[PDB]
Amino acid sequence: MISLIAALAVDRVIGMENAMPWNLPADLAWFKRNTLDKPVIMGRHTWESIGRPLPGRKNIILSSQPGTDDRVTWVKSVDEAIAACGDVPEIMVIGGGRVYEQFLPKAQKLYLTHIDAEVEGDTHFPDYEPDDWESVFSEFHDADAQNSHSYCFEILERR
Ligand SMILES: NC(=O)c1ccc[n+]([C@@H]2O[C@H](COP(=O)([O-])OP(=O)(O)OC[C@H]3O[C@@H](n4cnc5c(N)ncnc54)[C@H](OP(=O)(O)O)[C@@H]3O)[C@@H](O)[C@H]2O)c1
Ligand SMILES: Nc1nc(=O)c2nc(CNc3ccc(C(=O)N[C@@H](CCC(=O)O)C(=O)O)cc3)cnc2[nH]1
């Protein structure tokens, strides 16, 4: 199956100028717990903002262009990206906005982190209609001396 994972601020802001405007490490641990030993598909701008490969995962980059780094796999369409994952239990789509938009219809599960922050951004997660989605898990955390916002983890599965 295909799953999307994303961290959303208020009004579904997911980014600004390609950046990590928030250093919330509990959500990073959640991201790694849920993408470890799976293929991860990302768009080229998200690849350039991560800065490096994510180790322990098959990194597949969508770009209309050929490869600029042979440490990762390059694909030039959605059909090719899914094919390049091979037969697996779960394909993780890790953004960004343009890529989330395209894989939402082909998505059976959402891993969403909702962060209590406002950050005047320039990229937004898809405005699905949640009627098509059921929440199957919601785990809320208040701020700590390590994460300076409250956040909810949510898993949503297509009904
Ligand atoms: N908060 C989160 O969870 C989260 C997660 C991921 C990313 N982000 C943020 O999202 C922002 C970047 O998102 P973005 O929407 O600008 O870019 P993106 O989706 O990461 O990448 C867009 C690029 O991917 C390629 N691409 C997309 N669809 C393609 C297709 N069907 N076929 C071939 N190539 C395709 C294209 O590369 P070419 O132009 O080379 O052709 C396109 O320009 C950043 O700010 C990032 O920090 C946030
Ligand atoms: N919930 C969620 N959190 C995120 O941080 C996230 N990030 C992306 C894409 N951006 C990034 C940026 C950095 C790293 C990263 O450095 N990952 C490391 C964590 C650092 C560590 O190992 O301690 C990793 O190995 O997973 C991953 C994805 C997409 N969806 C997400 N979804």
UniProtKB/Swiss-Prot annotation:
CDD domains: DHFR. Signal peptide: none annotated. Changing residue 16 to N: Increases catalytic rate about 2-fold. Increases catalytic rate about 7-fold. Substrate binds at residues 5, 27, 52, 57, 113. Pathway: Cofactor biosynthesis; tetrahydrofolate biosynthesis; 5,6,7,8-tetrahydrofolate from 7,8-dihydrofolate: step 1/1. Its EC number is 1.5.1.3. It catalyses: (6S)-5,6,7,8-tetrahydrofolate + NADP(+) = 7,8-dihydrofolate + NADPH + H(+). GO terms for cellular component: cytosol. Changing residue 28 to R: In strain: B[RT500] isozyme 2. Residues 1-158 form the DHFR domain. Pfam families: DHFR_1. One of its GO terms (molecular function) is NADPH binding. Changing residue 42 to Y: Increases catalytic rate almost 2-fold. Increases catalytic rate about 7-fold. Keywords: Antibiotic resistance, Methotrexate resistance, NADP, One-carbon metabolism, Oxidoreductase, Trimethoprim resistance. Changing residue 20 to I/V: Increases catalytic rate 2-fold. Belongs to the dihydrofolate reductase family. Key enzyme in folate metabolism. Catalyzes an essential reaction for de novo glycine and purine synthesis, and for DNA precursor synthesis. This is Dihydrofolate reductase.
